[PDB]
């Protein structure tokens, strides 16, 4: 049977989030990017709502909760993109939302296409490894908790215990399917290495974001208010490497 924390994680997953994308026009660069940012705004709200129901998270110092969301939001979004792409279209298109699904044809602009190829690595890996829902849900919590400030968190003890609890839960999720301690251990290595490797992937998205944000008026790309604040609050600092990514492996 499914362990209870994993069932709970299933229960607190967000409902379907639409981009509000007007698929009557053809997209220019600016309209496509504006629509993705609009979806991003809706997804950021969803992430904060999700965190309020995530066992353990609400008990961290509020400053730590805000910090962790501000550090991890891009990571959580691209990881979720990967999941939806894996689930709905077998990793072969990028399933941003049910009203915003991009195939290669719709990826005209050079830099955005390159960004998409980077993002595509996640669903490709989900397909290759045959990641389960139970594994995904635990890994997703670990991503929220995968980067801390250089000086640590105010609730560092609580945070460490929470992170340990979800590591143990990933081990249970793996154990649902991987039988044998070697197969299970090898799988744990694989899934945690994927998370380690996400730090490098997300750096590329961070840079793209800040570039687009700084150039937003010139590119005619709208950045809604909540996303603008998360970007302004932490992205330059994160990009400068003044944070501590946590790694499972050396
Ligand atoms: C939505 C969504 N799903 O996965 C990802 C990644 C996103 C996402 C994440 C961040 C942002 C912020 N704007 S941006 O960084 O210029 C950008 C745009 C536009 N599209 N994407 C994929 C990015 Cl990153 C917009 C969309």
Curated annotation (Swiss-Prot):
GO terms for molecular function: ATPase binding; DNA binding; DNA-binding transcription activator activity, RNA polymerase II-specific; DNA-binding transcription factor activity, RNA polymerase II-specific; enzyme binding; estrogen response element binding; identical protein binding; nuclear receptor activity. Keywords: Cytoplasm, DNA-binding, Isopeptide bond, Lipid-binding, Lipoprotein, Membrane, Metal-binding, Mitochondrion, Mitochondrion outer membrane, Nucleus, Palmitate, Phosphoprotein, Receptor, Steroid-binding, Transcription, Transcription regulation, Ubl conjugation, Zinc, Zinc-finger. Phosphorylated on multiple serine sites. Several of these sites are hormone-dependent. Sumoylation is hormone-dependent and represses transcriptional activity. Sumoylation on all three sites is enhanced by PIAS3. Desumoylated by SENP1. Signal peptide: none annotated. It comes from the Eukaryota. Coiled coil: none annotated. Interacts with SMARD1 and UNC45A. Interacts with CUEDC2; the interaction promotes ubiquitination, decreases sumoylation, and represses transcriptional activity. Interacts with PIAS3; the interaction promotes sumoylation of PR in a hormone-dependent manner, inhibits DNA-binding, and alters nuclear export. Interacts with PRMT2. Isoform A interacts with NCOR2. Isoform B (but not isoform A) interacts with NCOA2 and NCOA1. Isoform B (but not isoform A) interacts with KLF9. Interacts with GTF2B. Belongs to the nuclear hormone receptor family. NR3 subfamily. This is Progesterone receptor. The lineage of its organism: Eukaryota, Metazoa, Chordata, Craniata, Vertebrata. The chain holds residues 683 to 932 of 933 of the full protein.
């Amino acid at each position: 049977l499914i362990p209870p924390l994993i069932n709970l994680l299933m229960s607190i997953e967000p409902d379907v989030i639409y981009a509000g994308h007007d698929n009557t026009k053809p997209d220019t660069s600016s309209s496509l990017l504006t629509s993705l940012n609009q979806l991003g705004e809706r997804q950021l709200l969803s992430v904060v709502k999700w965190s309020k129901s995530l066992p353990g998270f609400r008990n961290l110092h509020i400053d730590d909760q805000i910090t962790l969301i501000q550090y991890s939001w891009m990571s959580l979004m691209v990881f979720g993109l990967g999941w939806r792409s894996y689930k709905h279209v077998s990793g072969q298109m990028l399933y941003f939302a049910p009203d915003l699904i991009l195939n290669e044809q719709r990826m005209k602009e050079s830099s955005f296409y390159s960004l998409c190829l980077t993002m595509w690595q996640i669903p490709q890996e989900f397909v290759k490894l045959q990641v389960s829902q139970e594994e995904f849900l635990c890994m997703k919590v670990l991503l929220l908790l995968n980067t801390i400030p250089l000086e640590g968190l105010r609730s560092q003890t609580q945070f460490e215990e929470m992170r340990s609890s979800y590591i143990r839960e990933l081990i249970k999720a793996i154990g649902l399917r991987q039988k044998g301690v070697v197969s299970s251990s090898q799988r744990f290595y694989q899934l945690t290495k994927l998370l380690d490797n996400l730090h490098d992937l997300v750096k590329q998205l961070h840079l793209y974001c800040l570039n687009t944000f700084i150039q937003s008026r010139a590119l005619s790309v709208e950045f809604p208010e909540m996303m603008s604040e998360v970007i302004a609050a932490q992205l330059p600092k994160i990009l400068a490497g003044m944070v501590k990514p946590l790694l499972f492996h050396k």
